[PDB]
Design a protein around this nucleic acid. Structure first.
Ligand code: MG
Ligand code: ZN
Ligand code: ZN
Ligand code: ZN
Lengths: 69, 171, 115, 147, 265, 87, 45
RNA sequence: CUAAGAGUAC
């Protein structure tokens, strides 16, 4: 849905490394492994947290709000 | 269809004895056994009545000799109840209660053996690994049923004829 | 539904104490101490420090069920040596060792320049 | 973990592994039993209502519904509906001529609970009001769940 | 005299050291205590005034409870269970408040830098969410379309990782001993040659390799452990180790205290 | 009933108590104890009716008799006193 | 009176029992009841 | 109430 705050296995905070990851993939044209290593994710438990995330929140945000102020 | 029965998922427990069965706490609170008030057990039955039905161990009903049934819910308003010899306290099943234990595709006698209650704090029946072979039961989602005897004769014959150790060698 | 509260893993319940000692009738000069709201963390440490003792003939611990936070420690010492005294000495040695370790780590950390 | 059991990490569950949302919807309509025997969504009153359920009616507001955000437990009434009946019947000891309405409420499931997520009011094909109440709860993995 | 320590790497969030002249039980107990026995501050109760986002209320509450908060002076705070207030007060909690609105035509990201501490801290050093990245924005809490609003108030208490993993300060702790397998505590699985098929650990450089002809040393015990503690951010990484040692010492001292107080009765 | 009752001097059944006979005797005696029947043995602090009946059976103080029915309708009366509880 | 929101206008409409269930801006017949005012308590666990 | 469908463990 949205990026998890912490790695399930060890508990490292990965919730603040999502936008940087997308920026590295887009602006710097890095591949996924180098981008994950650049953010400091060295254990594969954290690498699977960031690498396999599906950011469904954008699809939800495409619909108009039910209660608009 | 019968009363005083439960059904739920089963999980294995290496820390239970062969003839023990782990019973979820809520199931133990729902199912009850009627114990006749006797001079030998007046104190503990009184204590269970004082504890009430919302906490385990406790009693859910008091069956008077006149047939009137005092529901322990809404009875704390009336105050403490004095028990008389010959009354019945319908109380939560505690440890070491003989209970019949079954897995429904019951093809032979050893699929309906009798266990001893051990109250546990989760939502699954817990049984020894070795006893799963006569039941033909795995832990991939199997459900099993529990029947509580309601008298001293049925309790006695359930412990003395259908007990798990007595069924180790099959005919 | 039936899941117990997590604070029961470490908070002492009402009406129960941290330790309870029962004499052991199997062997002479042996006791069984039940520790409540404890786990392998303390049990393994206490067991190892007791086995370091020279007048302890037997020392073992076990957690009977993972559901409940408690464990049992059986201690048997030589004649004329109270098992409670052996437990006291084991705890004192553990505390001294931990204090020395903390001092050593603080001194080593204070020497860092890239921290 | 013998016999197809599994050991799941408790700390990983605490951090959000395999957590789920569950939504359940209850639908109810007011129906024209006759020309002017229309059912009405409302909060039933014990003074003039029959067959009121043992669950609490406190959580219902004026229009016989529950505003989203209110916690509801088992057997609590979430839709309050009443139907007109023939008056002037005396029985049961506490039934007088005032009991001119029969309770047709919809309680929550006896085993489930959660927060009321969204209630929706609209009109059916015939033009009669009907409602849908959606309740949200959180399923956290525990001993007995299948994976 | 006693356990000796020599640290290889010191960083802001990692410390890599050697723990020699100590029993295996002591090292493992220290590791366990560091994992799940050090008190920490984390959000525990959430009051949702307004939520028109696309996420559920308890979804956002779960995310908020996982936000690391500063816990340097958490020893001054008291547990809510042993405080005399009704629900929460200044002596046992920290009150933050999140208030975000989607006034921009594009998506607005609600980060953890937007959390505001409302209750007075009485000069302590607790409460502030930990910020690590270079942009300055903390954990991405939520996202807002135009016209959506999120207003809520959080109460944070102190707790340990046993009650919930959100209070854990320690992340992953590397623990190794005897890199050369001289104690024969493992039997290496292999197909052709176990030495070629099992990669050497990085710690093998710190011990003398076996001579390959000497007899097995049956009197040798296990010591000289290699450990690496990482910090989530709530407390500095050295404080994790120091407070773990302190907590283990406190537990042993409490055992002594109970023994002595029931000895005198 | 005079014709049915096999005389005691020529009973032809086993002198050993069967498992079902023992189970029913224990159940019956425990049920009677639970309903305030007099106890024929001295209690050592036991309160469970089943174990009280077990103690009564161990030293043969249960005043009941089994009426074993033969398939033709005849019966033999075996007192619990004279039945050998080998099992 | 009690408030509702149109499904496709997000317009607040207070309605009584005798009022016809419709939106006064577009005529839409689907209305969502407004959020409750009483406080809601969540355990962050 | 009846009917129908999807199932779970054998
Ligand atoms: Mg199966
Ligand atoms: Zn990780
Ligand atoms: Zn306080
Ligand atoms: Zn509209």
């Amino acid at each position: 849905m949205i990026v998890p705050v912490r790695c399930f296995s060890c508990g490292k905070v990965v919730g603040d490394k999502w936008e940087s990851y997308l920026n590295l993939l887009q602006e710097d044209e890095l591949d996924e492994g180098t981008a994950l290593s650049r953010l400091g994710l060295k254990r594969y438990c954290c690498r699977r947290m960031i690498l396999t995330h599906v950011d469904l929140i954008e699809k939800f945000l495409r619909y108009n709000p039910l209660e608009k102020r | 269809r019968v009363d005083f029965s439960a059904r739920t998922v089963i999980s294995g427990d290496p820390n239970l004895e062969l003839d023990q069965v782990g019973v979820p706490k809520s199931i133990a609170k729902t199912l009850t056994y009627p114990e006749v008030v006797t001079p030998y057990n007046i104190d503990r039955l009184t204590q269970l009545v004082r504890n009430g039905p919302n906490e385990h161990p406790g009693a859910k009903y008091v069956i008077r000799d006149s047939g009137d049934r005092i529901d322990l819910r809404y009875s704390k308003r009336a105050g403490d109840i004095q028990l008389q010899y010959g009354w019945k306290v319908e109380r939560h099943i505690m440890d070491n209660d003989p209970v019949l234990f079954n897995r429904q595709p019951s093809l032979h006698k050893m699929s309906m053996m009798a266990h001893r209650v051990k109250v546990i704090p989760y939502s699954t029946f817990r049984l020894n690994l070795s006893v799963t072979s006569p039941y033909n039961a795995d832990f991939d989602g199997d459900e099993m049923n529990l029947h509580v005897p309601q008298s001293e004769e049925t309790r006695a014959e359930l412990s003395q004829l259908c007990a798990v150790p007595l069924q180790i060698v099959s005919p | 539904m039936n899941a117990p509260d997590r604070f029961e893993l470490f908070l002492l319940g009402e009406g129960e104490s941290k330790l309870k000692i029962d004499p052991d009738t199997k062997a002479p000069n042996a006791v069984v101490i039940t520790f409540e709201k404890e786990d392998h963390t303390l049990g393994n440490l206490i067991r190892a420090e007791l086995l370091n003792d020279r007048k302890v003939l037997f020392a073992a611990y076990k957690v009977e069920h993972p559901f409940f936070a408690r464990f049992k420690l059986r201690i048997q010492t030589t004649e004329g040596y109270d098992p409670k005294d052996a437990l006291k000495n084991a705890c004192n040695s553990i505390i001294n060792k931990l204090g020395a370790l903390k001092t050593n780590f603080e001194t080593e950390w204070n020497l860092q320049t890239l921290a | 973990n013998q016999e197809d059991s599994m050991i799941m990490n408790q700390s990983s569950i605490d951090r959000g592994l395999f957590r789920s949302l569950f939504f359940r919807s209850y639908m109810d309509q007011e129906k024209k039993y006759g020309m002017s025997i229309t059912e009405t969504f409302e909060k039933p009153q014990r003074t003039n209502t029959l067959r009121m359920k043992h669950g609490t009616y406190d959580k219902l507001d004026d229009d016989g519904l529950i505003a989203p955000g209110v916690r509801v437990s088992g057997e609590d009434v979430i839709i309050g509906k009443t139907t007109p009946i023939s008056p002037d019947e005396e029985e049961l000891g506490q039934r007088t001529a005032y009991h001119s309405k029969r309770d047709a409420s919809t309680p929550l499931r006896s085993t489930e609970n959660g927060i009321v997520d969204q209630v929706l009011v609209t009109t059916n094909q015939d033009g009669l009001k009907f409602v849908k109440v959606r309740v949200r709860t959180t399923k956290i993995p525990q001993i007995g769940d299948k994976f | 005299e006693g356990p000796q320590v020599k640290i290889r790497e010191a960083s802001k969030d990692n410390v890599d050291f050697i723990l020699s002249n100590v029993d295996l039980a002591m090292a493992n107990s220290l590791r366990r205590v560091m994992i799940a026995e050090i008190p920490t501050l984390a959000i525990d109760s959430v009051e949702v005034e307004t939520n028109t986002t696309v996420l559920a209320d308890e979804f956002i509450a779960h995310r908020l409870g996982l936000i690391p908060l500063q816990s340097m002076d958490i020893e001054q705070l008291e547990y809510s269970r042993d405080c005399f207030c009704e629900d929460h007060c200044d002596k046992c909690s920290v009150v933050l408040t999140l208030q975000a609105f989607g006034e921009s035509e594009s998506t607005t990201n609600v980060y953890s830098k937007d959390l505001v501490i409302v209750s007075n801290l009485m000069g302590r050093n607790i409460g502030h969410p930990i910020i690590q990245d270079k942009e300055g924005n903390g954990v991405l809490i939520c996202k807002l379309r135009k016209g959506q609003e999120l207003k809520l108030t959080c109460v944070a208490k102190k707790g340990i990782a046993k009650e919930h993993a959100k209070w854990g300060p320690a992340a992953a702790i590397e623990f190794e001993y005897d890199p050369w397998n001289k104690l024969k505590h493992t039997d290496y699985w292999y197909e052709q040659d176990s030495a070629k098929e099992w990669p050497q650990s990085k710690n093998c450089e710190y011990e003398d390799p076996p001579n390959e002809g000497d007899p097995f040393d049956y009197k040798a015990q296990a010591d000289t452990f290699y450990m690496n503690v990482e910090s989530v951010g709530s407390i500095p990484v050295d404080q994790v180790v120091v407070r773990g040692i302190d907590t283990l010492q406190k537990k042993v001292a409490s055992i002594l205290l109970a023994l002595t107080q029931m000895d005198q009765d | 009933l005079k014709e049915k009752a096999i005389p005691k001097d020529q009973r032809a059944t086993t002198p050993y108590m069967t498992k079902y006979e023992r189970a029913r005797i224990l159940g019956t005696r425990a049920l009677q104890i639970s309903m305030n029947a007099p106890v024929f043995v001295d209690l050592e602090g036991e309160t469970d009716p089943l174990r009280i009946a077990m103690k009564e059976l161990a030293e043969k103080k249960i005043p009941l008799v089994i009426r074993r029915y033969l398939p033709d309708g005849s019966f033999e009366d075996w007192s619990v006193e004279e039945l050998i509880v080998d099992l | 009176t009690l408030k509702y929101i149109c499904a496709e206008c997000s317009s607040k409409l207070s309605l009584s029992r005798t009022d016809a269930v419709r939106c006064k801006d577009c005529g839409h017949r689907i209305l969502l009841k407004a959020r409750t005012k009483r406080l809601v308590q969540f355990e962050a666990r």
